């Protein structure tokens, strides 16, 4: 069983920059990867920006301490535009790029060739099939899903996804990596939505349906779930938070895999806004208007 | 427009005792009604022990007031084994008895005769057609739904369920009373499960199904939702908390009136536990072993 020390993170976006941040903070040598030096540049600036916010509150007393913390972490995150140039000596690759299967498969098929023999490949994919992406390579026993949640620096959960071919050796290492990252790992078969989303997304859709059916206003449904179920955010607040686009995307997927299914029936209200570009907190408006 | 001051709570079990207490505690004259004296005695007993728990904490410095508060609250709660003799001049009737729709309509039918003209009628049923109950009286415009959540003295949400016949005045009346109790009211049509249970119960079933499917363990699923969604309890912990038998009676109810909807399909595991009388925390065993 190998102990992850060098981690290559492919995708300097929302989920990837977060993943690079935690790994560096927790003592892993990291190489962040994205299509351009400009994009990379911006990502590290965001990782830095996120780090100081963590510094000035983890070291509110001693600013210098917080500075050191920031500089050291940021300094153990290198940046490259071609993952193939660094994976030959990395222990784990965590992929977090476009949620497109063809692109991923193309990515891994290539990396498969450069990466050392012990290197493990993990996809932070939210809706695709891990087993699929895994089959674009000849290294499935070393392939699995390592699903994090936004925002990564804060969310403590991480789902370790096991394809039928992933090996125990590979699994345990991914669990130990998760624990090393300071997160709490949990196991789940390679099934759509894994756990969190499989149980969360259908819930939100139902909320939109009760609203659409005119059974209650959004404001009252949100209140009801916050006060009567103890949820942090009402379903509509949560929808605007995770992104209407993101949701719509995932549900079209599940619907398309099984159209006769009523749980995945589309949503006019959701569709209109996705159309009107109102994506939620992202764009400054979703179901609710934001500053 | 009517202001509730005298409240008649029929049924002193879990929800009933709680409604009585919150009522009495906020200055509402209360008459608690149940089938037998022994029952009433014990029901009033629990309100006392629960009120003191509070007293011991809130009135640490001033113990004198602690007692005063408790005693005044209790003295403001009368008891009776004859519902009809109490409603002669009451403002509101909050029903909270056996969830079987029969006994409900029989009880309400008989009282419609003795209650004053202005008196409003409300059911706390979690899953029953409010209308089926209203139409058991000739007081429909004064008949609504008032859904509370356990423990009624802590949960602040109150679902005010309106039927097509319910008058606006009877609505605005139940809203104020809700506020007067220190609760926060939301509006919803008489759609099965209303809001909260409508969105929570099916989600809890999906968690069980994900388990029965061998996709993940009960423990991880809970962690998943806790750390993944920020929920207070996992669906399994929550299930054992709300009582398995309860849950089932609700899913069965919806299943019958929609024997095809896949979201209400009965669950093996769930039916086996109900069978083995392992209803959850209130049994020491449900999905987990307790006490
Ligand atoms: N949006 C969310 O909240 C969320 C939560 C969990 C998981 N996910 C999943 O995680 C992945 C991460 O998505 P994200 O939200 O951070 O998106 P993002 O758009 O913020 O980031 C993706 C990054 O991928 C880069 N990229 C694209 N193609 C590439 C390639 N061939 N080689 C290298 N880099 C490439 C892009 O330049 C971009 O910066 C997706 O598969 C998604 O389904 C998203
Ligand atoms: N359990 C929950 O989480 C929950 C949440 C919301 C609403 N409710 C609803 O509230 C109601 C209260 O349920 P509960 O959990 O307290 O049950 P319960 O059995 O503990 O309490 C009911 C009380 O009703 C009495 N009763 C029954 N028939 C009667 C009659 N004809 N006349 C007088 N008293 C009678 C019983 O003796 C008992 O004391 C139910 O209709 C239920 O659906 C329960």
Report resolution (Å) to 1 decimal: 2.6
H or E element that contains A81: none
Residues 6+ apart with CB under 8 A from B283: B277, B290
H or E element that contains A237: helix A235-242
Write out the two tokens for B82.
């004859």
Cα–Cα separations (whole angstroms), residue B256 to A2, A201, B196, B248, B249? 54, 26, 20, 12, 11
Residues 6+ apart with CB under 8 A from B190: B129, B130, B131, B145, B161, B162, B163
Q: Does the beta carbon of B201 sit less than 6 angstroms from any atom of ligand 2? A: no
Contact B41, B32 (CB under 8 A): no
Hey, which residues does A31 pair with through a beta bridge? A8, A78
Q: Does the distance separating the beta carbons of B206 and A202 come in below 8 Å? A: yes
Contact B260, B290 (CB under 8 A): no
Searching chain B, which residue's CA lies closest to the CA of residue A151? B228
Residue B30 φ then ψ, to 5°? -125, 135
* Domain ranges, ordered by start, for chain B: 1-196, 200-286
Write out the two tokens for B59.
């009135």
The Cα–Cα gap between A258 and B67 comes to 62
Kindly list the residues from chain B whose CB atom is less than 8 angstroms away from the CB atom of residue A189: 214-216
Helix, strand, coil percentages for chain A (3-state, nearest 5): 50, 15, 35
H or E element that contains B6: strand B6-10
For testing the chain A interface, which of B185, B202, B220 should be mutated: the one with the most A CBs within 10 Å?
B220
* Residue A164 CB neighbours (<10 A): 10
- Say whether domain B200-286 belongs to CATH 1.10.1040.10: yes
H or E element that contains A135: none
Q: Using CA positions, which residue lies closest to atom 33 of ligand 1?
A: A34
What burial letters (b/e) apply to B114-126, b meaning 16+ CB within 10 Å? ebeeebbbbbbbb
User: Relative to the alpha carbon of A83, which ligand is closest?
Assistant: 1
Contact A85, A70 (CB under 8 A): no
Nearest to A138 by CA among A158, A151, A157, A119: A119
Write out the two tokens for B270.
């769930």
Q: Does the distance separating the beta carbons of A156 and B224 come in below 8 Å? A: no
Q: Does the beta carbon of A247 sit less than 6 angstroms from any atom of ligand 1? A: no
What burial letters (b/e) apply to A109-124, b meaning 16+ CB within 10 Å? ebbbebbeeebbbbbb
* Residue B214 CB neighbours (<10 A): 8
Q: At A29, is the secondary structure helix, strand, or coil?
A: strand
Q: Is the peptide bond before B268 cis (omega within 30 degrees of 0)?
A: no
Q: Does the beta carbon of B14 sit less than 6 angstroms from any atom of ligand 2? A: yes
Method: X-ray
Write out the two tokens for A256.
């398309």
The Cα–Cα gap between B169 and B181 comes to 18
Q: Looking up tokens 């780090």, which residue turns up?
A: A51
Pocket test for ligand 1, best of A8, A9, A10, A11 (most atoms within 8 A of CB): A11
On the CB side of B131, how many CA atoms lie within 13 Å of its CA?
9
The Cα–Cα gap between A222 and A61 comes to 38
Q: Does the distance separating the beta carbons of B261 and A214 come in below 8 Å? A: no
Write out the two tokens for A212.
């659409």
Q: How much is the CA Rg of chain B, to the nearest whole Å?
A: 20
**Residues A177-183: contacts with CB within 8 Å, 24+ apart?**
A177/A4, A177/A7, A177/A92, A177/A146, A178/A146, A180/A4, A180/A26, A180/A27, A180/A28, A181/A22, A181/A23, A181/A26, A181/A28, A182/A22, A182/A26, A182/A156, A183/A22, A183/A148, A183/A156, A183/A157, A183/A158
Residues 6+ apart with CB under 8 A from A162: A144, A145, A171, A187, A188, A189, A190
Residue B218 φ then ψ, to 5°? -55, -45
Q: Where are the beta strands (DSSP E) in B12-128?
A: 29-33, 77-80, 92-95, 120-123
Nearest to B172 by CA among B181, B162, B182: B162
The Cα–Cα gap between B131 and B189 comes to 10
A285 secondary structure, DSSP code: B
Measure B64 CA to nearest chain A CA, in Å.
Answer: 33
CATH topology of domain A1-196: Rossmann fold (3.40.50)
Contact B241, B232 (CB under 8 A): no
Cα of A83 from ligand 1 centre, angstroms: 15
Q: Looking up tokens 């749980």, which residue turns up?
A: A263
Q: Does the beta carbon of B13 sit less than 6 angstroms from any atom of ligand 2? A: yes
Q: Does the distance separating the beta carbons of A195 and B221 come in below 8 Å? A: yes
The Cα–Cα gap between B159 and B161 comes to 6
* Residue B63 CB neighbours (<10 A): 11
H or E element that contains B188: strand B184-189
Chain B residues within 8 Å of chain A (Cβ atoms): 149, 155-157, 159, 184, 186-189, 191, 195-196, 198-200, 202-203, 206-207, 210, 214-217, 220-221, 223-225, 227-232, 235, 261-263
* Residue B213 CB neighbours (<10 A): 10
Residue B128 φ then ψ, to 5°? -160, 150
CA A174 to chain centre: 16
Q: Is the peptide bond before B92 cis (omega within 30 degrees of 0)?
A: no
H or E element that contains B225: helix B218-229
Hey, which residues does B9 pair with through a beta bridge? B32, B94
Contact A186, A193 (CB under 8 A): no
Measure B198 CA to nearest chain A CA, in Å.
Answer: 9
């Amino acid at each position: 069983k190998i102990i992850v020390k060098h981690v290559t993170v492919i995708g300097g976006g929302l989920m990837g920059a977060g993943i690079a941040q935690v790994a560096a903070a927790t003592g892993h040598t990291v190489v962040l990867v994205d299509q351009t030096e400009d994009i990379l540049a911006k990502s590290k600036k965001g990782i830095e920006e996120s780090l100081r916010k963590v510094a000035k509150k983890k070291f509110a007393e001693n600013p210098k301490a917080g500075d050191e913390f920031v500089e050291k972490t940021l300094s153990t995150i290198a940046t490259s535009t071609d993952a193939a140039s660094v994976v030959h000596s990395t222990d784990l690759v965590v992929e977090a790029i476009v949620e497109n299967l063809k692109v991923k498969n193309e990515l891994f098929k290539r990396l498969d060739k450069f990466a050392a023999e012990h290197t493990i490949f993990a996809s932070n994919t939210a809706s695709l099939q891990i087993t699929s992406i895994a089959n674009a390579t000849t290294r499935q026993d070393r392939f699995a899903g390592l699903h994090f949640f936004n925002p990564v620096p804060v969310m403590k959960l991480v789902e370790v996804i096991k394809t039928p071919m992933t090996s125990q050796k590979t699994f345990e290492s991914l669990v130990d990596f998760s624990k090393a990252l300071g997160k709490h790992p949990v196991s789940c078969k390679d099934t759509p939505g894994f756990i969190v989303n499989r149980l969360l997304v259908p819930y939100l859709m139902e909320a939109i349906r009760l609203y659409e059916r005119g059974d209650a206003s959004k404001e009252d449904i949100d209140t009801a779930m916050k006060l009567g179920a103890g949820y942090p955010m009402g379903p509509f607040e949560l929808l605007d938070y995770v992104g209407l686009d993101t949701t719509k995307f995932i549900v079209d997927g599940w619907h398309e895999m099984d159209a006769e299914n009523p749980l995945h029936q589309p949503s006019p209200s959701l569709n209109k806004l996705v159309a009107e570009n109102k994506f939620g907190k992202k764009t400054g408006e979703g179901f609710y208007k934001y500053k």
